[PDB]
Amino acid sequence: PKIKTVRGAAKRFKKTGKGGFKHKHANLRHILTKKATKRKRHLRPKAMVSKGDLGLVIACLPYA
Template sequence: MPKVKTNSGAKKRFKMTGTGKIKRKHAFHSHILTKKSTKRKRGLVG
């Protein structure tokens, strides 16, 4: 049976850590930040 190809979208979005866990970026952090309150943006940090 042939090897299964990695999903090319997932390949770009997820990173594997040294221990084998998966890192990903969370939504609502990158743009249209002007209409979000400072309090809300502070909560999104981290």
């Protein structure tokens, strides 16, 4: 039967123009006041999935 998607992965990843995946950075969720503003700013924008974990993401998201 149809392959099922890993719904968590679906929530966390979105495919881009060539077939990458952007994702939201970790560590910008709670205790923030100790984190430096520069660090927070850098974490804020989205980020492409690296070469190492691309395969795993692909496995997770067969219909992405």
